């Protein structure tokens, strides 16, 4: 589409050579600054070489500006169950004389338990006491050593992905297109590196907007059913029992099993109770839908409407009513890149075909320009009021670009130049005015709003009284006279009607 907000910060800053024989470049290094633009615009970065007449540009595309948060930590908490078993034995020797553990023996495995498995998981080797007698299992009055072992299992295999965060910094998406032809996408943050690719390090800056009731919120998501929910989650490994933050593990691929060496649990997560050689275990682990302040995919806490934006590396978003933020400018840095220049530009001349659009408003006024040349793309339009750069193709084609005008009747003379050749163009058409749209029921904001032009807010006497009188440099007086005569005639008629009405009201009471 169109382009605006040119910079030209580091023109004529090359130290190249003959360039592979005919014309090439080596590297370009500098620094520029891109101002804030509306969502759905393009910011071009036009370079200028001292030898070559013109060069290519670098377009920056922004689609949505969502309110996401950072990533403090990452972990997976699998679902657990209640499993336990016991065994009944007799003393019959000096191993269970008085107590089961002499001083520190915690290995409650008498070469018979099933703890040496890969599906067992985490547990605690405990022990208890028993009774004596024929009904208790022995034939000698003595405390019987009865061992018990409990653990947790996961029959289904549901895996959750929790990511605590307490920053909620503004962010947006950037669809960057390199001048060579490669087009890639990435999600920059507010002050966070954006994984610089081929030297380009374009970053986004915000305004540090405060939050109303966002203190302890997380972005726990589900993997199988892809279900999202907003609920306060736990912190890193050092945690407390009573809320979310149950038995975790290393990663997702290691979350299917609850085995040790990666799974972390502090203490007191499963209870044990026994009366007579039973050792039954009860469940105390709560599911995700058990703590307070558990929201769902649609969340309208406060002025923010947290929706589920389909996007990679993040599924949490939200957009209040029109905010009109202060500034959202960018910062671009270069380290190294290669670009080719033709420097073989020939005669090129274009003209204007159509013109339409709004007044100085959001979408602007789009003007169609037709060109004809042999070079692929060598053009740079420069005029007063606004500057717009675009790319063309080989041969004769049609292109549509948008410019910013500050006059109702656009009748001026701009200068157009493609590569090294220059010419003159003219624009003539009628435009209209569109203000900020109003809010309607059933519609909710999705990403954000940038800004709306509401500066003048005053009627212009030049554009006004246009269709009232008429056209013409001398027909205006005739139109004014005719309108005045008609107004006087209608005023006399209305006065006569009012006099007749008053006369009818006075008499015949």
């Amino acid at each position: 589409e169109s382009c605006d907000e040119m910079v030209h910060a580091d023109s004529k800053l090359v130290s190249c050579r003959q360039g592979s024989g005919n014309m090439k470049e080596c590297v370009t290094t500098g620094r520029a600054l891109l101002p804030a633009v509306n969502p759905g615009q393009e910011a071009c970065l036009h370079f200028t070489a001292p030898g070559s007449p013109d060069s290519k540009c670098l377009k920056i595309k922004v689609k949505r500006i969502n309110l996401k948060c950072k990533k403090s930590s990452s972990y997976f908490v699998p679902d657990a169950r209640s499993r336990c078993t016991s065994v009944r034995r007799c003393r019959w020797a000096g191993d269970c004389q008085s107590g089961c553990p002499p001083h520190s023996t915690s290995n409650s495995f008498s070469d018979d338990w099933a703890g040496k498995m890969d599906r067992a998981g985490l547990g605690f080797s405990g022990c208890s006491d028993g009774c004596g007698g024929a009904a208790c299992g022995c034939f000698n009055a003595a405390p019987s050593c009865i061992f018990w072992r409990k653990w947790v299992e996961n029959p289904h295999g549901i895996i959750w992905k929790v990511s605590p965060c307490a920053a909620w910094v503004p962010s947006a998406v950037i669809e960057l297109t390199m001048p060579s032809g490669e087009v890639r996408t990435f999600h920059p943050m507010s002050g966070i590196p954006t994984q610089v690719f081929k030297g380009v390090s374009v970053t986004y800056l915000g305004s540090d907007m405060e939050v109303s009731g966002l203190t302890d919120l997380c972005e726990i998501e589900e993997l199988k059913s892809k279900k999202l929910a907003l609920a306060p989650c736990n912190q890193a490994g050092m945690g407390v029992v009573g809320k979310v933050g149950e038995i975790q593990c290393s990663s997702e691929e290691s979350a299917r099993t609850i085995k040790k060496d990666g799974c972390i649990w502090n203490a007191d997560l499963v209870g044990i109770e026994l009366r007579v050689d039973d050792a039954v275990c009860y469940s105390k682990i709560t599911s995700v839908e058990a703590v307070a302040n558990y929201s769902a995919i649609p969340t309208t806490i406060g002025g923010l409407r947290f929706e589920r934006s389909h996007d990679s590396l993040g599924k949490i978003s939200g957009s209040p009513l029109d905010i009109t933020a202060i500034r959202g400018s960018f910062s671009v840095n270069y380290r190294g890149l290669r670009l080719s220049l033709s420097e073989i530009t020939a005669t090129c001349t274009g003209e204007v075909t159509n013109v339409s659009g709004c007044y100085s408003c959001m979408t602007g006024a789009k003007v169609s320009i037709k060109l004809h040349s042999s070079k692929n793309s060598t053009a740079h339009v420069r005029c007063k009021g606004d500057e717009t750069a675009f790319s063309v193709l080989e041969g004769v084609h049609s292109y549509t670009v948008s410019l910013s005008f500050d006059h109702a009747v656009v009748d001026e003379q701009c200068q157009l130049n493609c590569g090294g050749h220059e010419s003159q163009v003219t624009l003539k058409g009628n435009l209209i005015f569109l203000d900020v749209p109003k809010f309607v029921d059933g519609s909710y904001m999705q990403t954000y709003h940038s800004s709306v032009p509401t500066g003048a807010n005053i009627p212009s006497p030049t554009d006004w009284l246009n269709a009232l009188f008429g056209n013409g440099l001398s027909r205006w007086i005739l139109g004014v006279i005719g309108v005045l005569l008609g107004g006087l005639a209608l005023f006399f008629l209305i006065m006569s009607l009012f006099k007749l009405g008053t006369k009818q009201v006075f008499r015949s009471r």
């Binding site: 959001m362 519609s443 999705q446 990403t447």
Partner: protein, 51 residues
């Protein structure tokens, strides 16, 4: 006249987001033919819908 309409033939619509020139919206009901509107007179001119 009111806005854009999304048509689904494979299955129902769970959730989707639409994009316009200078505005965006998001709505979901769970039917086949769902309607999504941005505002009153917000789309005036030549724009491209990216859902």
């Amino acid at each position: 006249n009111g806005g854009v309409r999304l048509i689904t033939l494979t299955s129902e619509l769970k959730s989707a987001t639409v994009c316009a020139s200078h505005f965006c919206s998001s709505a979901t009901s769970g039917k086949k033919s769902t309607e999504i509107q941005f505002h009153s007179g917000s789309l005036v001119g030549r724009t491209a819908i990216h859902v």
